Amino acid sequence: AAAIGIDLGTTYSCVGVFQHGKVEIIANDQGNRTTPSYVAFTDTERLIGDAAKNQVALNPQNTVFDAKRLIGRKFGDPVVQSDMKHWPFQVINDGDKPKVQVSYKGETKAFYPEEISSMVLTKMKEIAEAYLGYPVTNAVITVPAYFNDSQRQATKDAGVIAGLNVLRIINEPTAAAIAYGLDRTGKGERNVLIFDLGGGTFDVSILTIDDGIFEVKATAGDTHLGGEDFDNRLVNHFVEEFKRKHKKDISQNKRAVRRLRTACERAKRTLSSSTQASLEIDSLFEGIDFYTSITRARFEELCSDLFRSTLEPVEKALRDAKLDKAQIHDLVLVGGSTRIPKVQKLLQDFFNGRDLNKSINPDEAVAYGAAVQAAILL
Ligand SMILES: Nc1ncnc2c1ncn2[C@@H]1O[C@H](COP(=O)(O)OP(=O)(O)O)[C@@H](O)[C@H]1O
Ligand SMILES: [Mg+2]
Ligand code: NA
Numbered sequence: 520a521a522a523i524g525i526d527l528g529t530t531y532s533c534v535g536v537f538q539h540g541k542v543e544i545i546a547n548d549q550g551n552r553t554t555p556s557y558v559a560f561t562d563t564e565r566l567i568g569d570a571a572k573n574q575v576a577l578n579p580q581n582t583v584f585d586a587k588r589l590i591g592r593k594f595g596d597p598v599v600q601s602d603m604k605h606w607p608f609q610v611i612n613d614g615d616k617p618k619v620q621v622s623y624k625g626e627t628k629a630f631y632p633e634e635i636s637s638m639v640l641t642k643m644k645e646i647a648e649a650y651l652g653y654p655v656t657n658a659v660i661t662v663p664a665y666f667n668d669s670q671r672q673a674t675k676d677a678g679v680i681a682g683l684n685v686l687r688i689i690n691e692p693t694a695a696a697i698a699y700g701l702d703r704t705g706k707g708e709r710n711v712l713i714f715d716l717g718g719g720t721f722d723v724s725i726l727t728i729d730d731g732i733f734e735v736k737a738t739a740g741d742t743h744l745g746g747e748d749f750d751n752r753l754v755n756h757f758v759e760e761f762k763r764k765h766k767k768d769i770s771q772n773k774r775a776v777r778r779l780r781t782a783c784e785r786a787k788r789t790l791s792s793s794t795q796a797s798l799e800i801d802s803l804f805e806g807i808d809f810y811t812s813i814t815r816a817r818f819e820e821l822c823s824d825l826f827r828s829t830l831e832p833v834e835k836a837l838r839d840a841k842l843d844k845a846q847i848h849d850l851v852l853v854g855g856s857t858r859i860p861k862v863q864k865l866l867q868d869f870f871n872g873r874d875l876n877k878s879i880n881p882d883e884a885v886a887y888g889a890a891v892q893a894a895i896l897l
Contacts, residue, residue, distance in 0.1 A: 520653065520654075520655065520656070520657070521536050521537065521538050521651060521655065521894070522536075522537075522655070522657035522658060522659065522686060522893035522894060522896070522897045523535065523536050523643075523644070523647045523655050523657070523658050523659075523890060523893060524536070524537075524658070524659045524661075524694070524886050524887070524888070524889025524890030524891070524893045525640065525643050525659070525660045525661070525678075525886065525889060526661050526691070526694070526885040526886040526889060527556070527587065527636060527639065527640065527643075527660055527661065527662075527674065527677075528553075528556055528587070528717065528718070528885075529585065529587045529588065529717065529718060529719045529720055529745075530555065530556055530584070530717060530719050530745070530746070530747070531553040531554065531555055531556060531717075531718055531855065531882065532553065532554050532555075532556050532639055532643055533552065533553045533554070533882065533883055533885065534643040534644075534646055534647050534886055535883070535886040535889065535890035536647060536650075536651065536890055536893075537890045537891055537893065537894035538651075542698075542887050542890045542891060543650075544880075544883045544886060544887065545646050545647055545650045546646075546650075547568065547569065547642075547646045548568075548569070548646070548649075549569045552880070552882075552883060553855070553882050553883070554568040554569060554639075554642060554643065554646070555568055555569060555571065555572040555584070556584060556586070556587065556636075556639050557571035557572045557575070557582060557583070557584045557639075558571055558582075558583045558586075558635055558638045558639065559571035559574060559575070559578055559581060559582040559583070560581045560582075560583075560621045560622060560623035560624075560628070561574075561578060561581065561623070562624060562625060563624065565623065565638070567638050567639060567641070567642040568642050572584075575777060576774050576777035576778050576781070577774075579607040579608075579773070579777070580607055580608055580609070580621070580622070581608065581621045581622055581623070582607075582608070583608050583619050583621065583630075583635050585602070585606065585719070586632045586635040586636050587632075587636065588602050588742075589602075589610070589617050589619075589632035590632040590633055590636060590670055590673045590674060590677070591632075591633075591666070591667070591669040591670030591671070591672065591673035591674070592617065592632075592669070592670070593616065593617075594610075594612040594613075594615050594616060594617045595612075595615060599617055608620075608621060609621075611629060613629070616631065617631075617632060618630060618631055618632075619632070619635060632673065633673045633674070633676045633677040633680065634677075634680060636677035637676075637677040637678070637680035637681040638681075640660075640677055640678055640680075640681035641681045641682070644658075644681060644682065644683065655683075656682065656683060656684050657683070657684045657686055657893065657897060658678060658683045658684070658685060658686065658893060659685075659686050659687050659688075659689055659889045659890075659892050659893040659896065660674060660675070660678050660683075660685060660688055660889070661688070661689055661690065661691045661694045661885050661886075661888075661889050662674050662688055662690065662691065663690070663691055663720075663722060664690040664691065664692055664693075664722075664724055664735050664738055665722075665738055671688050674688060675688055686893060686896045686897065687892065687896055689889065689892055690724075690733075690735070691713075691715065691722070691853070691885050692713035692715065692722070692724035692853070693726065693733050693735075693888070694884070694885045694886075694887075694888030694889045694892065695713050695715070695851050695853045695884040695885055695888055696711050696713065696726055696728065696733070696888065697888035697891050698879055698884045698885075698887040698888035698891065699849070699851060699876050699879070699884075699888075701728060701849060701851075702728060702731050702733070703731065704728050704729070704730065704731065705730075706729075706730060707729070708727055708728070708729045709727070709728045709729075709848045709849070710725060710726070710727050710728075710736070710840075710842060710846055710848050710849075711725070711726045711727075711728060711847070711848060711849045711850075711851060712724070712725050712726075712833070712836070712847045712849070712850050712851070713725075713851045713853055714829075714833070714850065714851070714852055714853065714854075714857065714866055715740075715853035715854045715857075716744075716745060716746070716829060716853075716854040716855075716856040716857050716862060717745050717746065717853075717854035717855060717856060717882075718745050718746045718747055718854075718855060718856070719742075719743070719745040719746070719747050720740065720741070720742050720743070720744070720745050721740045721741045721742075721744040721745055721829060721832065721854075722738065722740040722854075723737075723738065723739045723740050723832045723833055723835075723836045724737070724738050724836070725737045725738075725836050725837070725840045725842065725847070736839075736840040736842075737835075737836040737837075737839040737840035738836065739832035739833070739835045739836040739839070740832045741828075741832065744825065744828065744829070745854075746784075746787070746855060746856040748822075748825055749818075749822050749825065749856070749859075750780055750784045750787060751780070752822050752825070753783035753786065753787060753813070753818065753821065754776065754779055754780050754783050756813075756817075756821055757779055757783065757798070757809075758770050758776070758779070760811060761804070761809060765804075765807055767804060767805065767807070769803065769804045772804060775804045778800060778803065779800065779803065779809075782798050782799075782800050783798070786798050786813060787818065787859075788858075790813070790814075790815045790818050790859075791858045791859055793815070794814060794815045794816075795812060795813070795814050795815065796812065796813055797810075797811070797812045798810070798811050798812065798813070815860075819861050822861075826859075826861055826862055826865055827865065829862065829865065829866075830865060830866075830869055833866070833869065844869075847870070847873075849876055850866070850870060850873060850874070850875050850876060851875075851876045851884070852866075852875050852876065852877040852881045852884075853881050853884050854881055854882060855881060855882035857877070857881045858881060858882075863875060863877070
C-alpha cells in the first residue's frame, strides 16, 4: 500500500505518489493536477475543491478558503484580526480559538480551521484512491518552514480527522529540494535557495544541506503577495476599460467582479505561454457582454512593481544567511506564479545568468518531494 505526499496549500493543494520507481502527480475529477483549497456549504451539499471555487460568485458567505492562515492560531492573534477584514465568511471566537461559521442544509454550523482543512485533505485522499484503486492511509503533509508547533499540530490533526496516518510533517522548501534530489550531496555543504511564489504568499528559504541533513539558514518573504495580487491588478485594469467603453462602473456589483476575477486568472495563465489572451464574459453587467484582450507586455506593466518587489526578500535572506550570490549552489523555482516569464527573468538576472531548476512543474514540486519522502519513511 503506497503512502502519499500532500501539499496542503494556502490556495491550491496537490497530491503525489511514488510508485514503480517514479513520482506521479495525481489529477483530480476535472483533470487538474492541483485542486483549490476551497470548501463550500449549500442548502443540499458540501462541495470541495474545483466545485467549491466554481460557485464562489453565487455563494460567498458560505464558501471558505484561506483556512491555512487560521490554522493553529488563537482568535486574538493580530494576524487573524487583520486577515478577517477581507474574508466574506464569518469568523467567530470559541474560547480564544477561531471558528468559521456558515449555513449548511439550512442550519448555522461552525468549524475549526483544522476541520475545514481536513475536508480538503479528504478530497486529496479520494483523488489518490481513485487513481490507485485501493484505500490509502499513510501520508506526509508539508507546512511552511516558519510554522510553529501549534500550527504543525493543528495540521497533523487535520490529517487525523481525514483518516490519515501522518508519517511526518516536513517543511515545504525541504520537500522541494528533495524533489530535485538535492538531499543527496556527499560530504560537503551545499546552499540551496527556494523561491516560492504561490497564490497568496511569497516564501524565500535558504537551506544548507550536508550529508542529507537539512538546516534552514534564513527565511524571508511576504505572506500577502502572490498570484491573487496579479489577478487583482488585471481586474482593476478591466473595470476601468469597461467604464471607458460602456460608461458604467461594475465595481459595486460583487458578482460581476468575481466573474471578472475568474476570467483574469485564466487569462494570466495563458500569458505565461502566449503573448496575448482573450477575455469573453457574456452578460457581465446589465446584459452587456465584455469581449476584450490583453497582451503579455501590458500585464507586465500592470504588475511591474509587484514583480520587482520579490527581489528584496531575496537580498534580505542572503544577508541573514551571510552568503553572497556566488555561494548559492542551486536555485529552485516553486509555486504556480513562478511560471510567469518576467519573474523568471528577474531572478535569473539578479543571479547573473544562473540556471534555474524548473523542470518539475513548480506548483507540483512540494507534493513531488513529499511523495518521495513518504515512500522512504515506509
Ligand atoms: N501558468 C501559470 N501562469 C501564471 N500563474 C499561474 C499559472 N499556473 C498557476 N498559476 C498561479 O499559481 C497560483 C497558485 O500557486 P500554487 O503554488 O499552486 O499554490 P499555493 O501557493 O497555494 O501553494 C495561483 O495564483 C495561480 O493562478
Ligand atoms: Mg505552495
Ligand atoms: Na500548492
